[PDB]
Amino acid sequence: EISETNTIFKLEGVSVLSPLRKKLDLVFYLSNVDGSPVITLLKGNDRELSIYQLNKNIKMASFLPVPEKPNLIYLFMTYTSCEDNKFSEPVVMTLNKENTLNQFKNLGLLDSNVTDFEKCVEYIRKQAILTGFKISNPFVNSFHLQCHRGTKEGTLYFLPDHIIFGFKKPILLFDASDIESITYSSITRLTFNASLVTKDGEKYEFSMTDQTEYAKIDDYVKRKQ
Ligand SMILES: [Cl-]
């Protein structure tokens, strides 16, 4: 099923966080059934996860920064399952840039003395384009900040069309048009709480946001309304 012929691109040893924490190989290839592009995450020859019909089944795909780790980058994707019976499903992996660069040099995808990891991002985005989907790179307007959801810290990403709270379970993804309101409230002298409610009546509290980020968040919301 996966052969050297038929594989577009393979990245070994990516660190998958969701829907499981495991070091796996990312493979983009063409099905032998119909030649249709498939993304899978492999342990050895075994498949942990597959995404098929990428043209219609990939809903969201973005490179996102890892806060404080310039050494890493997230790839985040949501998808309808191969059997069209499971919807908006999240995958998150980190890529180590130094290793990704180095692997790319070994596969001859990049000349020996390439310093710039954004060359890898250009290639991967191109491989998505050829393969029927698009990966956004919204950060390289958008912003992200640390907050708590209860006792657990997480990160809030304010993207052109989505807000993400990631990436410990459960990852929250909000379409920007589903925000009904945000109400602000304070708890510290240097922080504020953001109470967000969605069109379906669900309320999420994001506590302890630095008040440097209020200006940004309010302007975001007002624009998206
Ligand atoms: Cl987005």
mmCIF file of C-alpha atoms and ligand atoms in Angstrom:
data_model
loop_
_atom_site.group_PDB
_atom_site.id
_atom_site.type_symbol
_atom_site.label_atom_id
_atom_site.label_comp_id
_atom_site.label_asym_id
_atom_site.label_seq_id
_atom_site.Cartn_x
_atom_site.Cartn_y
_atom_site.Cartn_z
ATOM 1 C CA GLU A 1 0.000 0.000 0.000
ATOM 2 C CA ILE A 2 2.840 2.448 0.898
ATOM 3 C CA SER A 3 5.826 2.060 -1.382
ATOM 4 C CA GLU A 4 8.747 4.230 -2.466
ATOM 5 C CA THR A 5 7.021 4.726 -5.919
ATOM 6 C CA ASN A 6 3.896 6.174 -4.502
ATOM 7 C CA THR A 7 5.023 8.246 -1.483
ATOM 8 C CA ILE A 8 5.182 12.003 -2.003
ATOM 9 C CA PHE A 9 6.896 12.975 1.228
ATOM 10 C CA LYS A 10 8.012 11.323 4.507
ATOM 11 C CA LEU A 11 9.057 13.047 7.725
ATOM 12 C CA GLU A 12 10.363 10.653 10.365
ATOM 13 C CA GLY A 13 10.096 11.057 14.151
ATOM 14 C CA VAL A 14 7.506 13.870 14.467
ATOM 15 C CA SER A 15 6.175 14.270 18.027
ATOM 16 C CA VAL A 16 2.415 13.669 17.914
ATOM 17 C CA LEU A 17 0.468 15.087 20.921
ATOM 18 C CA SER A 18 -3.114 14.527 19.766
ATOM 19 C CA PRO A 19 -5.031 12.215 19.405
ATOM 20 C CA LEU A 20 -2.114 10.305 21.027
ATOM 21 C CA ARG A 21 1.384 11.113 22.351
ATOM 22 C CA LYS A 22 3.828 9.081 20.264
ATOM 23 C CA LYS A 23 6.833 9.613 18.004
ATOM 24 C CA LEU A 24 5.640 8.738 14.496
ATOM 25 C CA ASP A 25 6.458 9.167 10.822
ATOM 26 C CA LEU A 26 4.381 11.540 8.715
ATOM 27 C CA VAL A 27 3.709 10.177 5.199
ATOM 28 C CA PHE A 28 1.949 11.836 2.287
ATOM 29 C CA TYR A 29 1.379 9.266 -0.460
ATOM 30 C CA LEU A 30 -0.963 8.246 -3.261
ATOM 31 C CA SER A 31 -3.425 5.376 -2.646
ATOM 32 C CA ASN A 32 -3.002 2.254 -4.843
ATOM 33 C CA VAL A 33 -6.792 1.797 -4.886
ATOM 34 C CA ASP A 34 -7.358 5.079 -6.802
ATOM 35 C CA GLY A 35 -4.107 7.091 -6.706
ATOM 36 C CA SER A 36 -5.779 9.559 -4.357
ATOM 37 C CA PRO A 37 -3.481 11.413 -1.868
ATOM 38 C CA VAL A 38 -3.469 10.148 1.739
ATOM 39 C CA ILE A 39 -1.775 11.424 4.891
ATOM 40 C CA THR A 40 -0.833 8.788 7.459
ATOM 41 C CA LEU A 41 1.152 8.646 10.711
ATOM 42 C CA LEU A 42 3.194 5.431 10.992
ATOM 43 C CA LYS A 43 4.993 3.406 13.613
ATOM 44 C CA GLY A 44 7.270 1.202 11.526
ATOM 45 C CA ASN A 45 5.003 -0.164 8.799
ATOM 46 C CA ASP A 46 1.892 0.209 11.053
ATOM 47 C CA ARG A 47 -0.668 2.999 10.685
ATOM 48 C CA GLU A 48 -1.775 5.024 13.666
ATOM 49 C CA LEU A 49 -3.922 7.495 11.795
ATOM 50 C CA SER A 50 -4.895 8.151 8.179
ATOM 51 C CA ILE A 51 -6.637 11.081 6.478
ATOM 52 C CA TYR A 52 -8.103 10.346 3.069
ATOM 53 C CA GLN A 53 -9.801 12.510 0.344
ATOM 54 C CA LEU A 54 -7.761 15.580 1.436
ATOM 55 C CA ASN A 55 -9.496 17.866 -1.112
ATOM 56 C CA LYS A 56 -12.818 17.651 0.788
ATOM 57 C CA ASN A 57 -11.844 16.105 4.180
ATOM 58 C CA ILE A 58 -9.214 18.465 5.537
ATOM 59 C CA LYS A 59 -11.042 21.332 7.286
ATOM 60 C CA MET A 60 -8.251 23.333 8.814
ATOM 61 C CA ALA A 61 -4.468 22.998 8.619
ATOM 62 C CA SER A 62 -2.030 25.467 10.131
ATOM 63 C CA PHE A 63 1.542 25.899 11.220
ATOM 64 C CA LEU A 64 1.452 27.519 14.689
ATOM 65 C CA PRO A 65 4.291 28.695 17.018
ATOM 66 C CA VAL A 66 5.142 26.745 20.189
ATOM 67 C CA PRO A 67 5.332 29.462 22.916
ATOM 68 C CA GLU A 68 8.913 29.836 24.213
ATOM 69 C CA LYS A 69 10.220 27.093 21.894
ATOM 70 C CA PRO A 70 11.640 28.684 18.704
ATOM 71 C CA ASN A 71 13.196 25.223 18.199
ATOM 72 C CA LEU A 72 9.744 23.711 17.540
ATOM 73 C CA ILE A 73 6.680 24.361 15.372
ATOM 74 C CA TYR A 74 3.187 22.886 15.594
ATOM 75 C CA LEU A 75 1.360 21.348 12.717
ATOM 76 C CA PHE A 76 -2.347 21.368 13.580
ATOM 77 C CA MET A 77 -5.043 19.834 11.373
ATOM 78 C CA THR A 78 -8.718 19.000 11.722
ATOM 79 C CA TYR A 79 -10.442 16.544 9.410
ATOM 80 C CA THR A 80 -13.537 14.484 8.531
ATOM 81 C CA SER A 81 -12.627 10.796 8.893
ATOM 82 C CA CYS A 82 -11.864 8.483 5.923
ATOM 83 C CA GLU A 83 -15.360 7.043 6.259
ATOM 84 C CA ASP A 84 -17.245 10.414 6.470
ATOM 85 C CA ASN A 85 -18.742 9.590 9.894
ATOM 86 C CA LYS A 86 -16.461 11.570 12.236
ATOM 87 C CA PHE A 87 -16.047 15.359 12.027
ATOM 88 C CA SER A 88 -13.622 18.200 12.966
ATOM 89 C CA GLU A 89 -11.039 15.745 14.342
ATOM 90 C CA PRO A 90 -7.754 17.295 15.681
ATOM 91 C CA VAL A 91 -4.140 16.198 15.035
ATOM 92 C CA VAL A 92 -1.263 18.102 16.633
ATOM 93 C CA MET A 93 2.411 17.332 16.170
ATOM 94 C CA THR A 94 5.534 19.312 16.856
ATOM 95 C CA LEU A 95 8.355 19.418 14.342
ATOM 96 C CA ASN A 96 11.883 19.955 15.529
ATOM 97 C CA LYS A 97 13.241 22.425 12.986
ATOM 98 C CA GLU A 98 16.934 21.483 13.195
ATOM 99 C CA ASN A 99 16.073 17.814 12.586
ATOM 100 C CA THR A 100 13.495 18.641 9.864
ATOM 101 C CA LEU A 101 16.173 20.739 8.057
ATOM 102 C CA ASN A 102 18.657 17.871 8.453
ATOM 103 C CA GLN A 103 16.203 15.235 7.127
ATOM 104 C CA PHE A 104 15.397 17.472 4.166
ATOM 105 C CA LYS A 105 19.117 17.715 3.363
ATOM 106 C CA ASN A 106 19.395 13.893 3.503
ATOM 107 C CA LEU A 107 16.473 13.384 1.080
ATOM 108 C CA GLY A 108 18.127 15.884 -1.285
ATOM 109 C CA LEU A 109 15.164 18.274 -0.920
ATOM 110 C CA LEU A 110 17.510 21.055 0.228
ATOM 111 C CA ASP A 111 21.175 21.911 -0.481
ATOM 112 C CA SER A 112 23.673 20.920 2.242
ATOM 113 C CA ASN A 113 24.230 24.451 3.612
ATOM 114 C CA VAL A 114 20.603 25.617 4.058
ATOM 115 C CA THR A 115 20.131 27.505 7.345
ATOM 116 C CA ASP A 116 16.479 28.494 6.972
ATOM 117 C CA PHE A 117 13.721 26.167 8.243
ATOM 118 C CA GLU A 118 11.115 28.295 6.436
ATOM 119 C CA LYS A 119 12.402 26.463 3.310
ATOM 120 C CA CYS A 120 10.899 23.277 4.892
ATOM 121 C CA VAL A 121 7.605 25.078 5.558
ATOM 122 C CA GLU A 122 7.540 26.254 1.913
ATOM 123 C CA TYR A 123 8.078 22.673 0.730
ATOM 124 C CA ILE A 124 5.445 21.147 3.057
ATOM 125 C CA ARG A 125 2.886 23.791 2.120
ATOM 126 C CA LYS A 126 3.710 23.100 -1.546
ATOM 127 C CA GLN A 127 3.237 19.354 -0.938
ATOM 128 C CA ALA A 128 -0.220 20.169 0.553
ATOM 129 C CA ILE A 129 -1.113 22.311 -2.489
ATOM 130 C CA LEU A 130 -0.123 19.516 -4.932
ATOM 131 C CA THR A 131 -1.922 17.026 -2.777
ATOM 132 C CA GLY A 132 -5.273 18.895 -2.728
ATOM 133 C CA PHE A 133 -5.323 21.006 0.457
ATOM 134 C CA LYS A 134 -3.817 24.145 1.969
ATOM 135 C CA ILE A 135 -1.775 24.598 5.159
ATOM 136 C CA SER A 136 -1.970 28.145 6.567
ATOM 137 C CA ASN A 137 1.041 29.829 8.114
ATOM 138 C CA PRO A 138 -0.900 32.713 9.757
ATOM 139 C CA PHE A 139 2.028 33.911 11.874
ATOM 140 C CA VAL A 140 4.678 34.270 9.149
ATOM 141 C CA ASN A 141 -2.589 40.396 12.571
ATOM 142 C CA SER A 142 -2.738 37.001 14.391
ATOM 143 C CA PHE A 143 -1.560 36.452 17.969
ATOM 144 C CA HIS A 144 -1.433 33.946 20.834
ATOM 145 C CA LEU A 145 -1.290 34.285 24.600
ATOM 146 C CA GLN A 146 -1.071 32.130 27.736
ATOM 147 C CA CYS A 147 -4.058 31.781 30.021
ATOM 148 C CA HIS A 148 -5.651 29.230 32.329
ATOM 149 C CA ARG A 149 -8.775 27.169 31.887
ATOM 150 C CA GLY A 150 -9.396 26.454 35.565
ATOM 151 C CA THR A 151 -6.110 25.210 37.078
ATOM 152 C CA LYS A 152 -4.511 24.171 33.790
ATOM 153 C CA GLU A 153 -2.506 26.557 31.676
ATOM 154 C CA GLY A 154 -2.933 26.486 27.922
ATOM 155 C CA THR A 155 -2.477 28.736 24.955
ATOM 156 C CA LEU A 156 -5.080 30.788 23.103
ATOM 157 C CA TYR A 157 -4.440 31.364 19.355
ATOM 158 C CA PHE A 158 -6.305 34.199 17.679
ATOM 159 C CA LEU A 159 -6.320 33.238 14.006
ATOM 160 C CA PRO A 160 -8.043 34.865 10.962
ATOM 161 C CA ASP A 161 -11.048 32.452 11.097
ATOM 162 C CA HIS A 162 -10.621 30.417 14.325
ATOM 163 C CA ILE A 163 -9.745 30.597 17.967
ATOM 164 C CA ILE A 164 -7.858 27.624 19.372
ATOM 165 C CA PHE A 165 -7.224 26.790 22.991
ATOM 166 C CA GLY A 166 -4.477 24.183 22.921
ATOM 167 C CA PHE A 167 -3.185 21.697 23.351
ATOM 168 C CA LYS A 168 -3.931 19.509 26.398
ATOM 169 C CA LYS A 169 -7.197 17.508 26.185
ATOM 170 C CA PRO A 170 -9.701 18.820 25.346
ATOM 171 C CA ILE A 171 -8.386 21.089 22.557
ATOM 172 C CA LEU A 172 -11.044 23.755 21.886
ATOM 173 C CA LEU A 173 -11.616 25.012 18.387
ATOM 174 C CA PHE A 174 -14.022 27.900 17.807
ATOM 175 C CA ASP A 175 -15.058 29.288 14.435
ATOM 176 C CA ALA A 176 -14.757 33.051 14.749
ATOM 177 C CA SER A 177 -18.433 33.557 13.679
ATOM 178 C CA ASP A 178 -19.704 31.354 16.554
ATOM 179 C CA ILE A 179 -18.685 33.881 19.226
ATOM 180 C CA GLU A 180 -21.861 35.425 20.670
ATOM 181 C CA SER A 181 -20.117 37.632 23.246
ATOM 182 C CA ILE A 182 -16.957 38.079 25.341
ATOM 183 C CA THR A 183 -17.249 39.701 28.761
ATOM 184 C CA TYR A 184 -14.174 40.888 30.615
ATOM 185 C CA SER A 185 -13.531 40.706 34.327
ATOM 186 C CA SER A 186 -10.463 41.123 36.559
ATOM 187 C CA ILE A 187 -8.884 38.920 39.272
ATOM 188 C CA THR A 188 -5.295 40.226 39.562
ATOM 189 C CA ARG A 189 -3.803 43.734 39.184
ATOM 190 C CA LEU A 190 -1.926 42.745 36.039
ATOM 191 C CA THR A 191 -4.438 40.297 34.502
ATOM 192 C CA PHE A 192 -7.998 39.916 33.243
ATOM 193 C CA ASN A 193 -10.463 37.076 32.733
ATOM 194 C CA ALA A 194 -12.290 36.575 29.458
ATOM 195 C CA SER A 195 -15.717 34.935 29.555
ATOM 196 C CA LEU A 196 -16.578 33.793 26.075
ATOM 197 C CA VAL A 197 -20.022 32.457 25.133
ATOM 198 C CA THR A 198 -20.873 30.721 21.813
ATOM 199 C CA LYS A 199 -23.983 30.731 19.587
ATOM 200 C CA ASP A 200 -25.017 27.338 21.010
ATOM 201 C CA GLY A 201 -24.997 28.624 24.601
ATOM 202 C CA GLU A 202 -21.748 27.215 25.859
ATOM 203 C CA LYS A 203 -19.633 29.349 28.184
ATOM 204 C CA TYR A 204 -15.805 29.130 28.414
ATOM 205 C CA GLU A 205 -13.670 30.998 30.929
ATOM 206 C CA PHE A 206 -10.120 31.992 30.147
ATOM 207 C CA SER A 207 -8.474 33.326 33.264
ATOM 208 C CA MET A 208 -5.299 35.291 34.044
ATOM 209 C CA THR A 209 -4.632 36.808 30.601
ATOM 210 C CA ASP A 210 -1.983 39.601 30.770
ATOM 211 C CA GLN A 211 -3.827 42.899 30.369
ATOM 212 C CA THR A 212 -1.422 43.772 27.559
ATOM 213 C CA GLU A 213 -3.589 41.472 25.415
ATOM 214 C CA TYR A 214 -6.997 43.138 26.080
ATOM 215 C CA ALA A 215 -6.631 45.735 23.314
ATOM 216 C CA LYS A 216 -5.867 42.891 20.824
ATOM 217 C CA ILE A 217 -8.694 40.528 21.974
ATOM 218 C CA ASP A 218 -11.435 43.150 22.048
ATOM 219 C CA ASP A 219 -10.449 44.397 18.570
ATOM 220 C CA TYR A 220 -10.407 40.795 17.311
ATOM 221 C CA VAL A 221 -13.966 40.129 18.558
ATOM 222 C CA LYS A 222 -15.378 43.453 17.274
ATOM 223 C CA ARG A 223 -13.884 42.742 13.814
ATOM 224 C CA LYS A 224 -15.284 39.200 13.735
ATOM 225 C CA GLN A 225 -18.726 40.640 14.562
HETATM 226 CL CL CL B 1 -8.006 30.144 10.954
#
